């Protein structure tokens, strides 16, 4: 009865079609989930699974119209939905699922019950996958000498470590790094060995996320880093000299929002997943046309201060300080990146190091007090307070520091507060701050008379 | 006798099918109405409920063919439309809907009578809806440390018990409640009670709402409010300060109304359903561009006079205006909050408030009095009528008091306007409000002078 249905039954049993949540349906075959919007692949699935069928069953897979009928019963079948890629801790590759938590690798239908769309493009191979090798030597080599273990550059080490194993989490980061260093110090190299290492979930992008507009029109900048795990900005001009745009601080905000707002080129989707860890690559300080209290718990800076350099120039090299340790670079040493030879040494350094931080919340902690650009709005937010409880058992003594009343509110006068504010900063140094810091928070008493509603610190520490 | 058209009546008869005004059609499929505008789910239907139908109908509905049949049959039946959620009385679970006019909850064909195409999100557990259990005593212990039931806090308790209960109701509420309440005072508490508590139907918002236009284009923020029955908006910054933008008079007329005009991407629909409480929540007083009496009739407000702080800042939090009273802070209770383990009590909770203002219509009032912005009007208001039939044989003494008459409408210079509104409206105070009622409500006499179509009550009051 219905050998049709019966076989529908069979193919659903064996679980290789799913119902996604945007009305698609992904299918398993060749070893990977597969879907197309233009193009369903059931049918396909159908003749391909034609053999694990017993000998009666096949034989009704040979038509085309047969499969039909077996299509539009699998289609009625299905019901519920569900949701691709729902496993952060999960590496996939091109033919299975490593586990970086356990260091297990799958295959075929042990890889099966991760719903893993995308891939790094590039097999998987146990017998590289080693701690005792040659590789692993000059790998450690390198790295030692790009970062070095002097007990001055523990932090720095750890973060560095921190933010170039947290590229293997797929999952949304609330944090943007910046690999501080001048030219020929090590960033590209790690730039081409985290390439080589993480394959085709790796991508790179200018300036355009940068000081550009999102969202606007068609963008496929944004829409190209769907479901990707890292994005490198690399080539970035200074932004100190006039003539550059500035980083635009909504694009950091929504650089960071789980949800990322841009479509692509004739695609009604506009919703993406945003997995990808953004590295900013930079050879001199960064800054902001606006700087706000959100934008600085979103920034992390990684610090480089060893370079390589040829005989010619070493001692010009070897005459300043921030190239703090010196040394030779090789010329074949980018030929060996680029060979992949470290790819596996490289794929062992990471999940090690994501072991070491494998901890049950994996989270980016900002660091804000390493931008120059922060030093002003990090110190004056330590010295004034908002509006609080009760400033009534004070006003005898806050008078008489100059704070007034105003319907039991006490403010500050621009003159007065200009005066007790320039005995903790320089005025040429930090004039255009604080002139934007007192044009953007002033208060209006009325249009000619105006103040402002803090009160330091100092004055409510003394009594 | 068309053994397909008595399926197709049967399955009528089990009224799992209905049309909608819109021209879609909504099934009954795992316990919840669904629907899909480009893929009816009609012969998905007919597939899961083959099974109730008797044996001889059943295996004719293994063939696509007859399954097509059978909805054609279905869809030349259905004529009539429904509306859709139309209950504001009932709050929609994934299992089931329970009613707040007694209290029961129902399940499958109980559920079925109310369409209702949207739900909460979790399911419905019996157990822990108990009135008795230390769950909620301690609800009850954290509710009164943040509303106290003294006797300068009962109008206060009653509006904001009003304001979390009428987050339940589903339908288009009439006022946009202002949470009054500084930072660290008990509003984030409330906000993680409300959405632990209603699940999906609350949604959370920024400053895009309050301060930017909301027909625009393709809005997003506009297109999701779409069936909820909850708004906050947070972290929003001071608005007294120059370069925030204002609250938008007309954002805040279009929010109340029934009908939002707006559209997503790719999608022809323009129109969707208001049934969102929203919630203001701002550390300090609001400051709008423009206030009438529309927006009088608008607001309400609530405050808050518990703040909790650190030691090292409870001097700062201690030493300015805009608290009222100190307590002690729980660092745990977040993380039990995040565990869901006071939702039912709160539900509990927020059923008995619900029943407590339960009278035959709901709907929400307007306190203008909280708001400094509405006291000038509110005085000028109270403290003026324009001229009089009856003053006309009065105008011989309202002529002394420097009005002319002028066509039956008599007038006011405009420095004996300022004269004579300076006693009883401070100049000083008020002169920002004055002069902007002063250019607001002005009309014109002749060439040089200016003239008033409005009169002091004052003045008519005193013979």
Known sequence: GNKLFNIAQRILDTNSVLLTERGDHI???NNSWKFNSEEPLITKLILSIRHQLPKEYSSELLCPRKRKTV???????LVDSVETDTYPD???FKNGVLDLVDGMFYSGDDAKKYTCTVSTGFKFDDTKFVEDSPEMEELMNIINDIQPLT?????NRELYEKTL???????????????????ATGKSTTKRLLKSAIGDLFVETGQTILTDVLDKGPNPFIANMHLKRSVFCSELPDFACSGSKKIRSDNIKKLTEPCVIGRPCFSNKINNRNHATIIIDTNYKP??????????????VVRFRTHFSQPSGREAAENNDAYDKVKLLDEG???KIQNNRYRFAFLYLLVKWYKKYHIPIMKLYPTPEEIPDFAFYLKIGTLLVSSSVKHIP????????????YDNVVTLPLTTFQQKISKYFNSRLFGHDIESFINRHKKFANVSDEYLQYIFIEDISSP
């Open 27 to 29: 299918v398993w075959i």
């Open 71 to 77: 299509e539009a019963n699998i289609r009625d079948m």
């Open 90 to 92: 999960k590496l996939p």
């Open 151 to 155: 007990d001055e550059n523990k932090k």
């Open 165 to 183: 194993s947290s590229c293997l989490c797929g999952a949304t980061k609330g944090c943007l790094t910046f690999f501080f260093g001048e030219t």
């Open 287 to 300: 800054v902001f046309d606006r700087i706000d209290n959100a934008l600085m718990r979103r920034i992390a």
């Open 333 to 335: 040493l980018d030929g």
């Open 394 to 405: 004070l006003m005898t003594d806050l008078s008489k520091k100059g704070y007034i009343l």
